Amino acid sequence: TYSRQIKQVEDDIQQLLKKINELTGIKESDTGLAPPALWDLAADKQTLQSEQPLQVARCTKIINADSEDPKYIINVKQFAKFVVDLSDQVAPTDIEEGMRVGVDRNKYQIHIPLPPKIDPTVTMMQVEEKPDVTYSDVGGCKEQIEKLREVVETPLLHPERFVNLGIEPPKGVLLFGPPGTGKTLCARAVANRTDACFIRVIGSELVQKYVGEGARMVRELFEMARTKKACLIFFDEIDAIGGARFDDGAGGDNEVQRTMLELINQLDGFDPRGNIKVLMATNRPDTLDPALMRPGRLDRKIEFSLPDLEGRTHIFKIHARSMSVERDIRFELLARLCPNSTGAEIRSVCTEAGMFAIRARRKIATEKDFLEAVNKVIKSYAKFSATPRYMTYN
Amino acid sequence: ASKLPLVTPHTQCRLKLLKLERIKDYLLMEEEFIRNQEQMKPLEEKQEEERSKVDDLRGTPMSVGTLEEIIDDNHAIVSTSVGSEHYVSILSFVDKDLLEPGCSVLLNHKVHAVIGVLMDDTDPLVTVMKVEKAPQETYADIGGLDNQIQEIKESVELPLTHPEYYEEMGIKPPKGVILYGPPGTGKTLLAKAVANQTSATFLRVVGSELIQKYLGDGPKLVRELFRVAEEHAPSIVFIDEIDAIGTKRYDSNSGGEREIQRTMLELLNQLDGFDSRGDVKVIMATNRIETLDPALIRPGRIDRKIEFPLPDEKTKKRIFQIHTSRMTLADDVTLDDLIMAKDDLSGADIKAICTEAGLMALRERRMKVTNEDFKKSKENVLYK
Amino acid sequence: KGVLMYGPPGTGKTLLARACAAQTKATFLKLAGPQLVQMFIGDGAKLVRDAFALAKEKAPSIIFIDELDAIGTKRFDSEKAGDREVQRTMLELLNQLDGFQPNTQVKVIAATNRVDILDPALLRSGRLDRKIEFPMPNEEARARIMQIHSRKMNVSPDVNYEELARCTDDFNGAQCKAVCVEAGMIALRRGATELTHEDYMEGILEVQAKKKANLQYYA
């Protein structure tokens, strides 16, 4: 009855929204301005207060001091070098050598020290954020979860059981097995659970264009790592960052080996990382260099094999808990049909097995739908299978 | 502007009447709380006066600077265009947010203080690798296959258009899609119809153009590539001819096969990283399926493996009917004689014979294509 | 003038350097391997002459190099490719080390594990004089290392370091150090306070890191 009368009372008030929101001022789509109500702190006071009394105080870098006198030696980006002086606002204590300081443009004197450079590509690989993977989702390798977790978090969450016993806990661990076995997914539970800085590193990100460029990124990595109290450094696919040294005739693959040796030097010897724990994860460990494989760098040596039967059944219970199923199916029969299978393959059996229910017109899959998944995923993709030259890791 | 998301109803409901009249409550009551401003304290206009007060703070010589760090108490170290960086302060019309390390900003001329931020003109590479429009016709152009069309709609189209079927099932779509067979079988031609069908942002890259001449520029191109792939929204990344990274060696690449290898390590990360990946589907195609790394072909990184066989003869005649649809076919010809000419002819062979036969008609300025055009057309196309 | 240590990388090479660094009251100066590797040209070479200028200034001073093979790669004749800039700094390490205008004020302690990579120009007789290798411990030093690292732990007198060093062959100071810490962790796993023989015996199997595969079908 009020068919148009609801429409025009809708539209005139939705338009009159705009007819007064243009009278407010949010408009004039900018090139980088604030909303016009947001800025009124610097309206009359800080316009002539944060601008007219305020300087520029261009930052510099200190070379060194000298004895008996301030008489500082400063350095800048391109220009020359000066003998400079403090301000009265700061002590000469934390004006230590090799430090960035804010410096006025006329008297050229030091105002405030600055934090050092972090080279923000090293900043970007701090994780800032955690995944949601629970250790319950990594079922089937519980003893590896325990033997890893006793190294990763137990001195961090309890630094009294090791100290009051009088032992120093290990700091290094590699994780290795076939692909798809739950190594990366296993590290996601660590980045879930832990609390300190979790700085991730993928070995194919350090390959640089210049000579020795990647080795300085290792340096800045461990420099910002030693600033923190405790830190966890993650390493992924470390075959890219080094296998070994084999150089014969013409120098081939030299550049990566220097970054690898730099990583060795930053790991052991000469007042070590202290409270910095590392965690590698690779595919084929046989390529790796033995001086890298020395304990004191890679103490724990966790293998990820295939589950025997029951870890597989547990993985069936993991990926098959949250899907519309027939009630009276059994998973042990399915686990008897997969002697050598990874958890990702089991997940693909489940996720395909639901697609069989989506094929015709069924809301919950059956046991024969699972059997339609087993022969296709296991036995029809069996040309590829991705495993057997990685069981020997070759 | 994002005022009220309740736009459900879809009939003459009184809720719709009373809710729009309660927007009329927040707007009639408070348009009578819009009248009084310049009535009581005029003192300025505030539409341009305070605006020109900002514009009289900031000078016309607006130098363009670059962020590298942030200290929260509105001062930070910013980079000049020269390189000699400063330690200037930050204003209050700077809307303290769109500020990331590396961002283009607007500084003062005198004290170089952080006046404004700058919208980024992006990079041409996104427009280079980004497909703009729909390429060609639909799946009805294909013909004869009809089985894996359900597979590609299954893994790609149906998750996009129907986000109900996986939720009533309690399941997620399969991740990776790979396409393999003999050459010229329509592997790219299917992705053409996919790029017709989808509304998602579509990217396409050849596996040959992955490789570079500098060191690490390959894996860096991978990292910024998946950066571009993620930073939009639902997206489809297509990879053509990924065997070519492993087959052909070129002397432009300074690193040998152990630079290609590290590029494969970076890509091998970018398929199955620990990071939250997002809504990025991956469709790949090759013809040498046996050459590349099986570590990339594992379920989890590529879930669906799709082979394209050679066309059988009853599908061949369909493809002839497709490529001879809109042409003035003289009745001289018999397509069944053209079927068994080659025992393993591809779909490209049919279209090549058709187009070259049209070229033979246009040599003689005719309008229809006769039988001898096909007779010497198969000699021209096939036998050389 | 010039000593070199080489051998397996777990036999203890940093350890003597940090030992003598605690012993002598001189200007100890350490170096990293790829520390003389720079993006711009000549900067690593100037970094050599500045460091040896400073060690020239401190007349009681000795210089250490860790992992010399990062810069000490043997040269090679190659067209079309091949690095040179590392061999620049290597050549001023040669000349600036020994040759024109020598001196006896600094002593050089170089540490590597592999020798065949090295250019023999630094291996001459006088650039690096005393080339010593560090072998693997025979049996007694294997008992001695675990006896040293078994100091600050609650050790019950059920231990036999001669039995332990005999059932542990083919180990180094790092692995024999690792037996002590893993044996020190198993007792915390079982909640024990002291250390018994079987904690060491189980620590052996973790340090060896064998692949478990279902083998009881022998004998």
Ligand SMILES: Nc1ncnc2c1ncn2[C@@H]1O[C@H](COP(=O)(O)OP(=O)(O)OP(=O)(O)O)[C@@H](O)[C@H]1O
């Ligand atoms: N034990 C398991 N239980 C459940 N799921 C598993 C298990 N192992 C592996 N998966 C599945 O494997 C997928 C990927 O695992 P992950 O990336 O850790 O493989 P990986 O062992 O690191 O090998 P790669 O380094 O080649 O990736 C995950 O999505 C996970 O679902």
Ligand SMILES: Nc1ncnc2c1ncn2[C@@H]1O[C@H](COP(=O)(O)OP(=O)(O)OP(=O)(O)O)[C@@H](O)[C@H]1O
């Ligand atoms: N089944 C088919 N039906 C009709 N036309 C086809 C068919 N297969 C291929 N074609 C035609 O042949 C041409 C080449 O096909 P396509 O590019 O898909 O080959 P391809 O297998 O992707 O080759 P590659 O992957 O090696 O580049 C297309 O332009 C298409 O029109």
Ligand SMILES: Nc1ncnc2c1ncn2[C@@H]1O[C@H](COP(=O)(O)OP(=O)(O)O)[C@@H](O)[C@H]1O
């Ligand atoms: N007397 C010893 N014999 C062998 N190894 C020892 C001894 N004392 C300590 N160690 C262990 O061996 C390591 C020696 O370092 P080193 O072998 O020089 O490292 P690399 O040569 O791999 O750089 C130390 O980390 C230390 O824990």
Ligand SMILES: [Mg+2]
């Ligand atoms: Mg992984």
Ligand SMILES: [Mg+2]
């Ligand atoms: Mg093609």
Ligand SMILES: [Mg+2]
């Ligand atoms: Mg050392």
